[PDB]
Design a protein around this ligand. Structure first.
Ligand code: ADP
Ligand code: MG
Ligand code: MG
Lengths: 233, 204
């Protein structure tokens, strides 16, 4: 099976990648404390509550009891408790679910960040070719399988040699084709190179980052960051 | 500070309490977790009873290793504060003015130095606001003080709210002084301007 979001981001960081793993919470009280302690470091910052359930379309979905969205903004730790209280212990309905619901027993609480660009990127083991291949496109919010059927020319594909792995020219070109420029290019290479170090050194089948974004830091420094992660085995 | 900075938060005020660390290793961890919540953020390391900017958890470790167990009374603990974008520096204090026998609120737009120096060279920079201990600070007075410092929009009301919470720490603690140097206008990670107490001192 695939591991949860915040678990994937953690492994990505364990190999030198920048990802917003936030902090998990198995209760709405715990989630409130997380946002509260974070206000000590960045007072006035908003928060984002992300249901931890193995299925896509969380931002699109909704909850039975009236709440809309699996990824919702929160202005205060109290709002974090509200949202979290409606998530933990309830069922979420997304596109991958139809209407059978998925039991949500935990959520992830991360700080609200300003996003400048959103990209798709994944490291897939092309079995037909027996080699890894890197997919990407400048259409973060859309979905990989949706874009593929309607626009496969929207995707950039880069087969990877199993020996040396990524080629610095391959990665530099991919970052350049995605519209990146300046320090974000090398930063994108560093993270993407870390994604392979996660893909290969962990015997993984897929490392999907949707969206891989250009975010601003609290001091407004642009840095590549994985705002979502799925790792299949 | 931790007690005070929490008291402001206890009574409904914004205060960057950061987090204390009793060793360079601990300091490096605090900065690491913050990169899970706001990746790429910088950090500020404060030596507790001086302040250097750090770009990475490893830099924080370096700076902490220079402080803990060294000069500037001995320093045996540091406070790791996320690097927040600070726009304006203000100074604000509440005092039992023995001369007038009533609480008074002093404030200036030069929050980068001791109040002693500002008065001498610039006496126009300070703003006295005598407060009736019973009637307390009146909304009219605090709004007048807010606009006296160059605040507009939600900040004007945002200032009034924090000033009130500070007087409660002064009233409900019977404290002789409540000093906020600096009181900053800060941008949140999403570029929202808010008032925040960046340093606190409570005496008796
Ligand atoms: N920390 C964050 N701050 C602001 N927006 C965020 C943050 N994390 C995620 N988002 C936004 O929320 C959207 C939905 O989250 P995501 O993890 O992609 O869920 P899903 O793709 O399953 O719907 C993302 O596409 C992104 O635009
Ligand atoms: Mg996603
Ligand atoms: Mg910004």
């Amino acid at each position: 099976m695939n591991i949860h979001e915040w678990q994937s981001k953690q492994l990505i960081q364990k190999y030198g990648g920048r990802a917003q793993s936030g902090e998990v919470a198995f209760s709405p009280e715990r989630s409130r404390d997380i946002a509260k302690k974070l206000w000590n470091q960045f007072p006035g910052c908003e928060f984002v509550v992300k249901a931890q359930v193995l299925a896509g379309g969380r931002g699109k979905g909704h909850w039975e009891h009236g709440m809309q969205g699996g990824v919702k903004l929160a202005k205060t730790p109290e709002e974090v408790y509200e949202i979290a209280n409606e998530m933990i212990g309830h069922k979420l309905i997304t596109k991958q679910t139809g209407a059978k619901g998925i039991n949500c027993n935990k959520v992830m609480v991360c700080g609200a960040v300003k996003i400048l660009k959103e990209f798709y990127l994944s490291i897939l083991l092309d079995r037909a070719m027996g080699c890894p291949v890197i997919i990407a496109t400048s259409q973060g919010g859309m979905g990989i399988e949706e874009v593929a059927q309607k626009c496969p020319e929207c995707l950039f594909k880069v087969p990877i040699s199993v020996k040396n792995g990524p080629t610095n020219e391959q990665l530099v070109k991919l970052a350049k084709d995605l519209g990146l420029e300046g320090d974000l290019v090398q930063d994108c290479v560093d993270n993407v190179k870390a994604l392979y170090q996660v893909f290969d050194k962990c015997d993984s089948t897929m490392v999907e980052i949707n969206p891989l974004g250009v975010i601003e830091t609290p001091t407004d420094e642009k840095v590549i960051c994985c705002l979502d992660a799925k790792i299949a085995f």
